[PDB]
Amino acid sequence: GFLINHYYLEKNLGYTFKDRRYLLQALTHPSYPTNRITGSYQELEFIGNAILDFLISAYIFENNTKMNPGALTDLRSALVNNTTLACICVRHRLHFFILAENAKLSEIISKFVNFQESQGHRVTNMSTNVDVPKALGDVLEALIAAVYLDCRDLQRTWEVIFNLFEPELQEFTRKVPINHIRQLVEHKHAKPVFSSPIVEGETVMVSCQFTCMEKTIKVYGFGSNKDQAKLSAAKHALQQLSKCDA
Amino acid sequence: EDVEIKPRGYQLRLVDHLTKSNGIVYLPTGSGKTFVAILVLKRFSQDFDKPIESGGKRALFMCNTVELARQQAMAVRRCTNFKVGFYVGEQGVDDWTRGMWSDEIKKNQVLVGTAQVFLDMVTQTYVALSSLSVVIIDECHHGTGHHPFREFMRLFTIANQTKLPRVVGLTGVLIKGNEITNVATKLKELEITYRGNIITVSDTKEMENVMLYATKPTEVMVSFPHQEQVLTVTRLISAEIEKFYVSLDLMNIGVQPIRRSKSLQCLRDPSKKSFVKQLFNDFLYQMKEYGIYAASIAIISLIVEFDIKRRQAETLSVKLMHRTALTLCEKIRHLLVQKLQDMTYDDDDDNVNTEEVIMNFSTPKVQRFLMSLKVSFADKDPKDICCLVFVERRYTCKCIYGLLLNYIQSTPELRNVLTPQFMVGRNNISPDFESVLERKWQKSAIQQFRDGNANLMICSSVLEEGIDVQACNHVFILDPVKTFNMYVQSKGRARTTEAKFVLFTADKEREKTIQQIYQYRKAHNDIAEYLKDRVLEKTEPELYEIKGHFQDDIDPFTNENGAVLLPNNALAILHRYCQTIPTDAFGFVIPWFHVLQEDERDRIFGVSAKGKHVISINMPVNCMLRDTIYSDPMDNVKTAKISAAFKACKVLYSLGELNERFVPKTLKERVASIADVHFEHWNKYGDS
Amino acid sequence: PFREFMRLFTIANQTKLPRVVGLTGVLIKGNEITNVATKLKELEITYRG
Amino acid sequence: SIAIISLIVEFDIKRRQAETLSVKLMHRTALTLCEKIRHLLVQKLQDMT
Amino acid sequence: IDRYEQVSKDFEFIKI
RNA sequence: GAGACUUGGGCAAUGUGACUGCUGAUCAGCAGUCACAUUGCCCAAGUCUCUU
Ligand SMILES: Nc1ncnc2c1ncn2[C@@H]1O[C@H](COP(=O)(O)OP(=O)(O)O)[C@@H](O)[C@H]1O
Ligand SMILES: [Mg+2]
């Protein structure tokens, strides 16, 4: 009864749950008092984090040979980053089945999902987006451990992970996955310097002072927090540099 | 200060008697009773110097509120030569471990602070009752019900019954509330709660005459006719407000925590909607009680409060709600200012025009108040005048402060002699009228009052008692006197010579107020006669009634290591533990209670289930106490909740979540437990 | 009906009024015995004696 | 015991002035319950006679 | 009432 | 049985006076916890530049 139309989730995900209890525990956000029969999803995401990171690291170690470890660690960190997990969870329409309730968290999820719909459910490679919901990537990563425990086989879990990550794998393997921010600082002519950002309510800003095409330009960007305001400034600096390059 | 402080004729005998036996002092405010308390502290300092284990001790001075604790801390520090430790809840002693508690205990000779901190640190085995020399209580009349003073006193009953620390209580009022009836039983309950005998002034001519330097103020009163007709614009504003209420309840925000009755009997509006409706209803009461000009003053405060709340409103829907409230308040402000300016056409003398507008649109009570101020201050010097006014509502304070601002700007005689200022209780409201932090400021309104910056203060019972204020000469009370304690404490403030006590009441309420004033005077007198003639007993050595005072509640449970758990603190401990679990905003940590049903009551319990009620506790899914816990069957829902929380926290302690010292465990305890298991090889390398 | 009867006295003719006298062995009915003077006051003024 | 004996006469007389069978059956059931209670209580009485 | 009726200009403080 | 009176009994209606608990709403006063924000002390840690 908790899992309304769970067959839709299974069909989209591609796996079948012989026991549905693991799915309920994985979908049980801590803010959901009506579920007295299973625990929260923290005790599953704890294992799922290790499962995901080890599996993907082993895959890239075996396959992506022609690159140094100094960038292989960056690739694995990008592929395990919570933002990519949130994007993947958005792609598979898993927001529907999250047995969660909250005032502001639900608003954040709605804003993120409509933003991703605007982007076409593709990674914005890093996002100038308002704010990313951590719990979304958390529940997506936890359902991986839920899938594994339902079968106790690594091979099936890896098939599921690969089926979920095929576009991300093919993208990050070809193009440089991410460095960002730092490459702006170390850029050939871009020498960004910044002031201290201040948050207020649900708005934030930072004065970005950088250089571009041998000139000096100041840019601003929408965001949520101090460091993510600096992130928005970095995103718009990257946009200006790319457009000037283009 | 210095040693020029010379004890009076009554302080010496008071401290001499208090040395022999425990007792409570009862002297009028400003009679230097804290000074004789200091002298008492100067007779129990023998064990201050030596450390705890070597045989040395300390002393605990007690207070109810933070500010009074701090003020008396500076007082004792400047009056003595001891290392006075000052600690409160906000000071940061919450996370203090054993070592950085022990250092403070061993680096001080006397401790001061609030009730909760001292009570908790006594219950957390940091010190023992046997490890104390003398304990000093002030405003001892607070010691009733579940108040922390009585809870701390119960530790005297549960702990050792030999070489027990002294207890002394400081007060000037003995009764809290409208229970003036049967003063003798209240006095006896106060006697037994602090296991002492009240000692009071006795030798009339030599000593009460000297003590009466805290002179009794002269008291007067003024009556005014009732205003009965209601203005036409008021009902229009009420109609707009009620349709706004209908829209607000109709409009839809996301899921919000369910707030219900304090007895869980039925539902309530969501906290934000209840809050905004409380604002609007309070402003409406302001309008009817004080007219239109005062309403015009208060609507600006509502505007600024709504703007601040919308600014801090995280969710967009809450921002829309506050925006709609702001639009309605702006419309109300437009109508009010139009009505106020509707009369200003005829006259064109700006100062006199504003003065007569204030007089014209005001309620008769406020008109009488302002004319009384004009005829009392009488255009005198601004330095000598230092007057107080008491009003009941918080927003009434700010509104009347604005009204006095405008009126003082409207009279040349008062424009140079009065400097109004207001302050309220802990739920402080911004004194601004334009925007949040219009300017950064560093002086409290009380301090400005003390330095002569503000000769007139507006305040609720927040400035009634405790906080030291110079001898006032004029005190005014607008809203009706509510209790005995506030009346007597207010009349004690007007300490200077020929001080004036002033209060106001309506025409049809004067006769009622006669009984309250005469009853309060009789209640002050009969205490004097009865204590003057009480039975000469030593220290209330009736241990049978001492243990028969508290037994009717749930017996407090103590484990090994000497830690003791108070059943009345079970709710606080449970909620504090719940807050430890990390969560997002709406992720609730508070345990959602549930009252049982009689059919379910005897479905789970015996025949006694029908007679008395039971409440059930549920826990958030993150807490490992997944299984629900059913409270013991108690009579009322209050004791049911107390028993439920006590049993639940006992189960938590048994499971080890609650530590030995009865506090939730951080990661420090976890890593300490794991260290000698998983990280033993660090020690052979000299680390850990 | 005691003070109900005696309320007739004010509305009717206030002069050439029959003598009224109160007889009792107790004065206070209920647990409001506190401040006997003020409670005896309305007894005095209700019975115009 | 005396109380349950007393209840019998009041229940019976109430049934006597009872108007229709709907309350007659109610009083009859009440009297049967009262008599069963009385019998149980007198068994309790005689247990230690 | 349009205008609140004015209280007595002359008034003194009665003593309880 | 009725008409009326005498006394009593039965039922009902409604009102009055008092008491014990139980909650409701509003308002003031007090304590504690958690979190966020401001900048700084600030070491860890990686990157990068200079350079050590
Ligand atoms: N015998 C005395 N010696 C020295 N100072 C005194 C004496 N009597 C009164 N005082 C001073 O008068 C002041 C009275 O204020 P306080 O004692 O705080 O009033 P209360 O104790 O009633 O609240 C004290 O600050 C105290 O220093
Ligand atoms: Mg004092």
Contacts of the segment B588-591: beta carbons below 8 A, 24+ positions apart: B588/A31, B588/A33, B588/B257, B588/B620, B589/B620, B591/B617, B591/B618, B591/B619, B591/B620, B591/B648
Nearest ligand for residue B14 CA: 1
Residues 6+ apart with CB under 8 A from B400: B290, B294, B366, B389, B391, B422, B458, B478
Experimental technique of record: cryo-EM
Q: List the Cα angle D21/D27/D32 in 5-degree steps.
A: 125
Tell me if B468 CB under 6 Å of ligand 1: yes
User: Which nucleotide lies nearest residue C1, CA to C1'?
Assistant: F16
Query: Which residues contact residue B299 at a Cβ distance below 8 angstroms, ignoring those fewer than 6 apart?
Result: B283, B329, B332, B333, B336
| Type of residue numbered B574 | L
Contact between A35 and B618 using a beta-carbon 8 Å cutoff: no
Please tell me the distance between residue B122's alpha carbon and the centre of ligand 2 in angstroms.
26
8 A C-beta contact, residue A23 and residue A17: yes
Q: Helices H, strands E: what count in chain C?
A: 2, 0
Contact (CB, 8 A) for B324 and B337: no
Dihedrals phi, psi of B673, to nearest 5 degrees: -65, -40
Atom 4 (ligand 1) nearest CA: B5
E abuts D (3+ Cβ pairs < 8 Å): no
Which residues sit opposite B388 in a β-bridge?
A: B457, B475
Give the CA angle between residues B478, B482, B487 to the nearest 5°: 80
Show Cβ contacts of residue B676 under 8 Å, excluding neighbours closer than 6 positions.
Answer: none
Q: Write out which nucleotides of chain F lie closer than 7 A to a protein Cβ.
A: 10-11, 16-34, 36-40, 46-49
Closest ligand 1 atom to residue B37 Cα is 21
Tokens of D39: 């019998």
**Nearest chain C CA: its distance from B175 CA (Å):** 16
List the alpha helices (DSSP H) in B428-540: 445-450, 484-493, 510-532
Q: What are the backbone dihedrals phi and psi of residue B169, each rounded to the nearest 5 degrees, phi first?
A: -115, 135
Integer Rg of chain D from CA: 13
Token pair 């890093």: residue: A126
Q: Which residues surround ligand 2, an ion (CB under 5 A)?
A: B 34
Test the A interface: residue of B583, B621, B622 with most A CBs within 10 Å: B621
To test the contact with chain B by mutation, choose from A202, A203, A224 the residue with the greatest count of B C-beta atoms within 10 A, namely A202
User: For ligand 1, is residue B34 a contact (CB within 6 Å)?
Assistant: yes
What does the block give as tokens for B176?
């809290």
C29: the nucleotide nearest its CA (via C1') is: F18
Strand partners, A59: none
**Residue type present at position B405:** L
Grouping H, G, I as helix, E, B as strand and the rest as coil, residue B565 is strand
Residue A181's SS3 state is: coil
Burial of B433 (0-12, 13-18, 19+ CB in 10 A): middle
Q: Give all strands of the β-sheet with A215-219 in edge-to-edge order.
A: A193-194, A208-212, A215-219
Which positions of B make up the binding site for ATP?
A: 27-34
Please list, in sequence order, all residues whose beta carbon lies within 8 angstroms of the beta carbon of residue B547, skipping any fewer than 6 positions away: B157
Q: Which one of B315, B587, B622 has the shortest CB-CB distance to A107?
A: B315
Nearest to B365 by CA among E12, E15, E7: E7
| Nearest atom (ligand 1) to Cα of B28 | 22
Cα dihedral across residues A182, A183, A188, A191: positive or negative? negative
Element (H or E) spanning A211, and its range? strand A208-212
CB contact (8 A) between residue B360 and residue E1:
no
Nearest residue by alpha-carbon distance to C1' of F27: B393
- From C16's Cα to the closest Cα of chain B, the distance in A is 30
For residue A204, give the H/E element and its range: strand A203-205
Alpha carbons within 13 angstroms on the beta-carbon side of residue B335 total: 18
Q: What gap in Å lies between CA A207 and CA B680, rounded to an integer?
A: 51
* Contact call for E16 and B368, based on CB within 8 A: no
Ligand nearest to the CA of B3: 1
Contact B378, B388 (CB under 8 A): no
Measured distance CA(B515)–CA(B501) in Å, rounded: 18
How many Cα neighbours within 13 Å face the side chain of D38? 13
Long-range contacts of C4-13 (CB under 8 A, 24+ apart): C6/C46, C6/C47, C6/C48, C9/C48
Q: Which nucleotide is nearest to B278 (CA to C1')?
A: F26
Helix (H, G, I), strand (E, B) or coil at B470: coil
Q: Do the chains C and B touch each other, judged by at least 3 C-beta pairs below 8 angstroms?
A: yes
Closest protein CA to C1' of nucleotide F16, residue: C1
Cβ-based neighbours of B114, under 8 Å, separated by 6 or more:
B63, B64, B65, B66, B69, B88, B89
Contact residues, chain C, for B182 at CB < 8 Å: 34
DSSP B497: T
- Which ligand 1 atom is nearest residue B5's CA? 4
Q: Binding site: residue ranges of B?
A: 27-34
Resolution attained, angstroms: 4.2
Using a CB-CB distance cutoff of 8 angstroms, which residues of chain B are in contact with residue C34?
180-182
Handedness of CA A101, A105, A111, A116 (dihedral sign): negative
Touch criterion met for C and A (3+ Cβ pairs within 8 Å): no
Query: Nearest protein residue to F15's C1' (by CA)?
Result: C1
Write out chain E residues lying below 8 Å of B227, CB-based: 4-5
Q: Which domains does chain B have, with CATH numbers?
A: 10-219 (3.40.50.300), 220-227+346-532 (3.40.50.300), 557-670 (3.30.160.380)
Q: Which of helix, strand or coil describes residue B85?
A: strand
